[PDB]
Structures are given as C-alpha cells and as structure tokens.
Structure 1
Amino acid sequence: ARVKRGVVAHRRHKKILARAKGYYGARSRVYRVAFQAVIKAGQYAYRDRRQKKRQFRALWIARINAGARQNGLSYSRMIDGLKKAQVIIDRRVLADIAMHDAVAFAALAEKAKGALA
C-alpha cells in the first residue's frame, strides 16, 4: 500500500496561503514565510482581544472628564458623587450621553454635585 502525499499536502498549503491573503511580498506567496506570518497574526489577535477593553474604557473616561470639567466638576469628584447618589449608569452610557446630549449630562452633574454637597 504505497501512499502519495500530493493532494493532501497541496490542500494544506493552499489553505495557509489563502489565510495569508493581503500581506506584503513573500509573506503572501511563499509557504514558509506565510506560515510564520499567520501564527503571529493569531497571537496578536489573542492579545488584542484583551487590550481592546482597556483602550475603550480609557476613551470613555476621557470623554466623561471633558464633560465634567465643562460642568464644573472633575472626573473623580463626579464619579464619587454619582456613587453617593446611588446612580449605577456605567461609563459607556455616560460617555455616549456626554457626546450626544449636553443637557442630560448637565442634569447628571447637577445630581452628582448635589449628592456631594
């Protein structure tokens, strides 16, 4: 029972090269270089699925800081005031409201500073 390797080997190499579409130079043409490139892309994706949450939380905090300083508070004081007032709206919704609705954010800041007082 002699076995030839051509069909299966060709299928595996073609799948790797198909996943390597769009890369520069030999990285999308040459099997060795392409194979090294796909593994590194997977590792980067695994790491960045964790980095994404931190980056977006930082963005929300910056926007909330800008809105608070427009209303006369700092970010830390506004967060403490909301916690004391028992509002449990999270930073994503707070930043959305800060971006798109100034009056509602002003009301939230009034509530927070009233609780701080």
Structure 2
Amino acid sequence: ARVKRGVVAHRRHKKILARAKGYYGARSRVYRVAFQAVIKAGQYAYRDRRQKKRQFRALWIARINAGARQNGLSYSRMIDGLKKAQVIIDRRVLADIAMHDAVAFAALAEKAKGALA
C-alpha cells in the first residue's frame, strides 16, 4: 500500500501561498518564507485585537477632553461631574456627541458643572 504524497502536499502548500497573497517578494512566492509570514501575521492579529480597544478608548478620551475644554472644563472634572450626576453614558457615545452635536455636548457639560457645584 504505497502512498504518494503529491496531491495532499500540493494542496497544503497552495493554501498557505493563497493566504500569503499581497506580501512582498519571496513572502508571496516561496513556501518556506510565506509560511513564516502567515504565522507572524496571525500572532500580530491576536495581539492587535486587544490593542484596538485601548487605542479607540484613548481616541474617545481625547475628543471628550477637547469638547470639555471648549465648554470650560477638563476631562477629569467632566467625568467626575457626570458620575456625581448619575449619568451613565459611555465614552464612545460621549465622543460621538462631542464630534457631531455641539449643543448636546454643551448641555452635558452644563449638567456636569451643576453636579460639581
């Protein structure tokens, strides 16, 4: 029962090379190089699925800081005021409002100042 490896080996190599599409030079042509590139891409993606949440929260915080400073507060004081006022709107929605609706963000800042008073 002699077994020839050609068909299955070719399928596996072709699948790896297909996942390596778009890479530079030997990384999209040569199996030994392409296989390392795919694994490292997977490792990077696993790490960056965690990094993405941090980066987007940092962006929301920066935009909220800009809005609060336009309304006469700092970010930390505005967050403290909202907590004391019991408002539980999260930073993603707060930054969306800060970017797209200035009047509503002004109202939120006024509520935060009123609670801080």
Q: Same fold (TM over 0.5)?
A: yes
Matches of 1:104 and 1:10 in 2, distance apart?
Answer: 61
Matches of 2:21 and 2:114 in 1, distance apart?
Answer: 57
Matches of 2:28 and 2:92 in 1, distance apart?
Answer: 39
| Cα offset, 1:22, TM superposition | 0.2
The alignment yields a C-alpha RMSD, in angstroms, of 0.2
- Pairs aligned (count): 117
Secondary structure of the 1:22 match is coil
Matches of 1:99 and 1:56 in 2, distance apart?
Answer: 14
Secondary structure of the 1:23 match is coil
Q: Percent identity?
A: 100
| Cα offset, 1:41, TM superposition | 0.1
Matches of 1:30 and 1:109 in 2, distance apart?
Answer: 58
| Cα offset, 1:104, TM superposition | 0.3
| Cα offset, 1:96, TM superposition | 0.1
Unaligned runs of 5+ residues in structure 1 are none
- 1:63 matched residue in structure 2: 63
| Cα offset, 1:100, TM superposition | 0.2
| Deviation by residue 1:62-93 (Cα, 9 ceiling, x = unmatched) | 00000000000000000000000000000000
TM-score normalised according to structure 2 size:
1.00
Matches of 1:61 and 1:3 in 2, distance apart?
Answer: 61
| Cα offset, 1:38, TM superposition | 0.2
| Cα offset, 1:40, TM superposition | 0.1
Secondary structure of the 2:23 match is coil
Matches of 1:90 and 1:61 in 2, distance apart?
Answer: 11
